[PDB]
Amino acid sequence: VVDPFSKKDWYDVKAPAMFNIRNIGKTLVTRTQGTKIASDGLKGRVFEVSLADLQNDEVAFRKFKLITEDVQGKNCLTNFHGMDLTRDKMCSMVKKWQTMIEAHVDVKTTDGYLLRLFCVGFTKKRNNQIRKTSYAQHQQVRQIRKKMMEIMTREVQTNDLKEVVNKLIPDSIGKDIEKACQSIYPLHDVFVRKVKMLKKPKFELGKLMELHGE
Amino acid sequence: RVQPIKLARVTKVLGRTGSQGQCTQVRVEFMDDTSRSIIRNVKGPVREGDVLTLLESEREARRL
Amino acid sequence: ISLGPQVAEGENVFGVCHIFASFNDTFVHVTDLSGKETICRVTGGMKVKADRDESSPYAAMLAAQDVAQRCKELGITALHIKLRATGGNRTKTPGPGAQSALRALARSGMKIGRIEDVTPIPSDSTRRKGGRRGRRL
Amino acid sequence: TKKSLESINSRLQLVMKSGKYVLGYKQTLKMIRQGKAKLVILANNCPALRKSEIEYYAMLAKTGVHHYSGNNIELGTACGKYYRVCTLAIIDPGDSDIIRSMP
Amino acid sequence: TKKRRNNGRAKKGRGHVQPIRCTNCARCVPKDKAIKKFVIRNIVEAAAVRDISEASVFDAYVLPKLYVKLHYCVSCAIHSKVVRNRSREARKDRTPPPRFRP
Amino acid sequence: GRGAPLAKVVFRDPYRFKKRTELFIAAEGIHTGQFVYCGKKAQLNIGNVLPVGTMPEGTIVCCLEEKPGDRGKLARASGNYATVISHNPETKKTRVKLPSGSKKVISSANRAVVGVVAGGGRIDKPILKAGRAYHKYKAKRNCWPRVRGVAMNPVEHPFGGGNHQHIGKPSTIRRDAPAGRKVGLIAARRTGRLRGTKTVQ
Amino acid sequence: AKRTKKVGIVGKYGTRYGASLRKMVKKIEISQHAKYTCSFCGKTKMKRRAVGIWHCGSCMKTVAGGAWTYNTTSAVTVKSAIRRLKELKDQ
RNA sequence: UUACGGCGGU
RNA sequence: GCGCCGCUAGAGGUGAAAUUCUUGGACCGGCGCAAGACGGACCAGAGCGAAAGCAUUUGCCAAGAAUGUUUUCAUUAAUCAAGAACGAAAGUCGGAGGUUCGAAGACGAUCAGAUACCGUCGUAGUUCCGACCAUAAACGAUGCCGACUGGCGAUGCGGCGGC
Ligand SMILES: [Mg+2]
Ligand SMILES: [Zn+2]
Ligand SMILES: [Zn+2]
């Protein structure tokens, strides 16, 4: 008899200023009922959204997670939580008769935002190549995989979270190990497959208010 | 709820079906645009090109 | 007019529609952009009384119409798709109600954004419930 | 647990063949207090005030303390004898580069 | 008699390959004996394509694919007719049947 | 008469100049001349005792308090421990998992030494003769040679008597039976050799 | 010379107590009487005191270990997990 | 979905 | 499996069902946690190994084939009674563990009957440590060593030479 949707109000979700489209969408939550207050029911919600509705002309096979850390009245401010690729991209690039090399590393930034980076690469068939198997040897794989994680340890350890997350809207990490590996075995589909968040540095309030500033 | 009962014209008949040679497939056109065309199944003698009536519009053809 | 968000005359607000099209049943659960707040979960096995036909394409066809009629009436007007198969240990292709609950979700006046298959895939994890010789039928 | 330990215990069984060395606590205590010690190696087993007063004399003699990753019975086999030994001091490297290494 | 030159299995310098499990009966087969089939099926069911592009938020949206790799035991591969019985000299080719997509 | 060993620990009195000795249940792995740290801001190592609300989910805990400040009641026998899950930082209550597999939501400020109780594996060895059971209970109680009630007389037990040693009456009795009648399977939910695991919460 | 072929340490129990209980004992009984290598001085002088107590002849160090053996495998798994939970999350 | 037998010698 | 939510009345299972779980709120959707298994797609008529067998990264080891060799020893060799070493799975004994799967077993169906197939549940067992047992369609159903007797396209590893 009661309609619980008549007790619910709409907030709108905002992405940080690092992206072109600042407005993610609208969520809903029930109002305050004593100890059930209407803010902790939507702190820590994940919004699995892609780039192409968060940039203007960027790719669509990549998606960002965006936890909520603060509520500003009718607004619902967010911070970065992680990324991965879609399923259909990540299994369109796993084909036969090529080597899949994959690396992973735990690197924290200088802001205290410990990440786990996941990167893949696939060996590349050459243009004049006649034989079928474009396989790598095993000691080639070990030194490529050493070369992958050494580079993304550079690109994350040195500076803060904003320049890190800004590097992988164009995915210049996958393009930097693209150039640095093709004197070992050439690679072609080299992405950062997934970024996972391990830590958060106690949530200073003004750091989120910087991200939604200019 | 109420779908508009849509009269429909058949193009090429796709041969018999129905495990006894009793039903045939017609791939109607929808009498508003021949660009918009779905595959359907009817029973009885068909005579290629004519017009038949759909009490329901789009569910499924003979397809597992 | 007490229900509904604040939009313009042209724009639309996004929700996601989790399709769980296994065999034996089908789910056409719609929820918000974070997935936490359920808007409407209606099922193909709640509008037929036959128990063969819960995985039928036809029961999914009218479950998709019923979930659109609730979603559009509440103010949430465009859908993203997160179709599942059974996944995990079990089969990884979706059942017969998969496509029909998707097309009839769109034929009954509703927009569609990004779609994705989001079924559970293991990394070579766990045994299957069949026996070594499988099930023999 | 794969590649790198025979940097420090292949060099240790090469100084043992070529150069000079002393084993035991009260012999590297004589060699540290009259200038002749170069790189003292402590086991991971020695009592923690013995580890302190060798780390304190080596600061006074400006020498290096390498902390060996092993038992005192494991450092003895790495030397090449049937003992256990916490503290060694090499007083001449034969032709290797233990001092010219990291510590 | 020895029916086939390999014994149904593509192992030559091995003693044991991994056991995998069939899909539609959950029977345990060797990985080399198993009849694989990799389905790159479009998730949209092509009769239902002009009902999702006319109800999308774009005019040009590339539709996602469904990449399901089936693999069967030989018992369910013959019953579901993905491998057909062959004559005793037309068995001896390893070329798959041609495409016939249009 | 205890299966666990003990550890006597000297602390420094904060208020008087005095060293005063405690007696702990010995967590397994500790040695003499080891520093033991005890507080809220203590660091989670073996043998350190610290409140259950600060330590993470899934750490193994011995000798824990069932009400705060009760100085250790639960999970104290040799080889036994308890596991913590499920911190609720609002209305501060944490649930633990007792050595009987039964879970219990307790206060958050309950205090507990990190580790497992020493002397474990003790019940793996057979007593192996009647003499070493005698010395076992001479340390404990006057309880050991248990005469069956079927073997005694109708004054002495509800089960005794008869020309044959038989119970006669059903050996499962109610819980509100009086004293002198509760003998046997007291308020038994089931009998017979057990199947499954326990399947009753 | 060769004094037994099966019983070993449980030849003191004679014909008594059952073959499978004497076979069950002789894993426990070789293990509680064995000298273990000390982890603090490297000398194989870990003799067992009372049950759960382990003690060094030289360096005189007392260790609270298992009942019939120096390490219980339940207590090594926990020490692995405690230092893992102490480096994960950093509390 | 269920579908089990067919006297001996010629 | 358990917590904290969200909205709802079924979910599950099947050729059809039922036994079963569910407004002390299942199933589904979100976020976390824990445990134990297992390392998909890449994965091949590819590799290694005496055979059994071997697949996530990085790490202390100890071994090995082939190739390269104007090194060295100079018959040191092949097969091998007796005697040994290794040996899938199930099994046995003890200690840990116990997620899934699951002989025995209970129940629901199916049948003339079902002690079977099928469904719900589940013990021992599958997992680890230690000791055993020594067998398999342990199969290329083909002992090991040596030479000789057609062609061809390749592939895996070394070596050499070429636009
Ligand atoms: Mg008695
Ligand atoms: Zn099959
Ligand atoms: Zn000692």
Burial degree of C69 (CB within 10 A; 0-12, 13-18, 19+)? middle
* Positive or negative: CA dihedral A201, A205, A206, A211: positive
Q: Which of helix, strand or coil describes residue D53?
A: helix
**Residue A188 Rama label (left phi>0; alpha psi -120 to 50; beta):** alpha
Distance, C-alpha A198 to centroid of its chain: 13
Nucleotide nearest to A40 (CA to C1'): I5
C22 touches strand I (CB under 7 A): yes
Technique behind the model: cryo-EM
How many residues can be counted in chain C? 137
Closest CA to D78 of D28, D25, D29, D8: D8
List of chains touching B (3+ CB pairs within 8 A): C, E
Would you tell me which residues 57-76 of chain C have a C-beta closer than 8 angstroms to some C-beta of chain E?
none
> Would you state the structure tokens that stand for residue A70, as one six-digit string?
């603060």
Provide, as residue numbers in chain E, all residues whose Cβ is less than 8 Å from the Cβ of B61.
47
CA distances from D67 to A156, D28, D45 (A): 32, 15, 10
CA distance linking residue B13 with residue A206, whole number of Å: 70
CA distance linking residue C64 with residue E57, whole number of Å: 19
* Amino acid at site F195: R
**Side-chain-facing half-sphere of F148: CA atoms under 13 Å:** 7
* Amino acid at site C36: K
Q: Which of helix, strand or coil describes residue F109?
A: coil
- According to the annotation, is G17 in a ligand binding site? no
Q: How many domains does chain B divide into?
A: 1
C41 touches strand I (CB under 7 A): yes
Q: DSSP letters of F135-190? A: HHHHTT-S--S---TTSS-TTT-SS--SSS----S-SEE-TT--TTT--SEET-S-
CA distance linking residue A61 with residue A52, whole number of Å: 9
CA distances from G59 to D29, D79, F159, G37, G56 (A): 21, 24, 60, 13, 6
Neighbours of A93 (CB within 10 A): 19
Residue numbers 35-74 of G with CB closer than 7 A to any atom of strand I: 73-74
Q: Residues lining ligand 1 (ion), CB within 5 A?
A: F 146, 148
Contact: G78, F125; criterion CB under 8 Å: no
Residues contacting F100, CB < 8 A, separation 6+: none
> Would you state the structure tokens that stand for residue D47, as one six-digit string?
């009592």
Residue numbers 66-125 of A with CB closer than 7 A to any atom of strand I: 81, 90-91, 94-100, 102-104
Enclosing domain of residue B16? 1-64
CB E25 within 8 A of CB E75: yes
F85 forms beta bridges with F95
**Side-chain-facing half-sphere of E23: CA atoms under 13 Å:** 18
Residues contacting A42, CB < 8 A, separation 6+: A11, A27, A29, A68, A71, A76, C34, C36
Q: DSSP letters of A2-71? A: --GGGGEEEEEEE--TTSS--EEEEEEEE--BTTB-SSTTSTT----EESTTTSSSS-SSEEE--EEEEE
Which of B28, B38, B41 best probes binding to E when mutated, by most E CB atoms within 10 angstroms? B38
- According to the annotation, is G59 in a ligand binding site? yes
The residue lying closest to nucleotide I57, measuring its CA against C1', is A103
Phi, psi of E74 (to 5 degrees): -65, -25
> Would you state the structure tokens that stand for residue A202, as one six-digit string?
């106690």
CB A98 within 8 A of CB A144: no
**Side-chain-facing half-sphere of A128: CA atoms under 13 Å:** 0
> Would you state the structure tokens that stand for residue A138, as one six-digit string?
């095993």
CA distances from F33 to D54, E101, G75 (A): 21, 80, 20
CB D17 within 8 A of CB D96: no
Helix/strand/coil (H/E/C) assignment for every residue in A141-155: HHHHHHHHHHHHHHH
Closest CA to C28 of C40, C12, C15, C13: C40
CB E33 within 8 A of CB E83: no
Contact: G68, F122; criterion CB under 8 Å: yes
DSSP state letter for E64: P
CA distance linking residue C18 with residue C39, whole number of Å: 11
Provide, as residue numbers in chain G, all residues whose Cβ is less than 8 Å from the Cβ of F45.
82-83, 86
Chain C CB within 8 Å of residue E59 CB: no
| Distance to chain D for G74, nearest Cα, Å | 24
Closest CA to G27 of G55, G7, G50: G7
Q: What share of chain E is helix, strand, coil (3-state, %, to 5)?
A: 10, 20, 75
D42 forms beta bridges with D67, D87
CA distance linking residue F77 with residue G67, whole number of Å: 13
Q: How many Å from the CA of G29 to C1' of I88?
A: 35
Chain C CB within 8 Å of residue A13 CB: yes
Residue numbers 1-20 of D with CB closer than 7 A to any atom of strand I: 1-6, 9-10
Chain E CB within 8 Å of residue B14 CB: no
Burial degree of G15 (CB within 10 A; 0-12, 13-18, 19+)? exposed
CB C134 within 8 A of CB E26: yes
Burial degree of G86 (CB within 10 A; 0-12, 13-18, 19+)? middle
CB B28 within 8 A of CB B38: yes
* Positive or negative: CA dihedral D35, D37, D39, D40: negative
CA distance linking residue E59 with residue E52, whole number of Å: 11
DSSP state letter for G17: S
Contact: C32, A28; criterion CB under 8 Å: yes
CA distance linking residue A14 with residue A42, whole number of Å: 13
Nearest ligand, CA of residue G38? Answer: 3
Q: DSSP letters of D57-70? A: HHHHHT-EEEE-SS
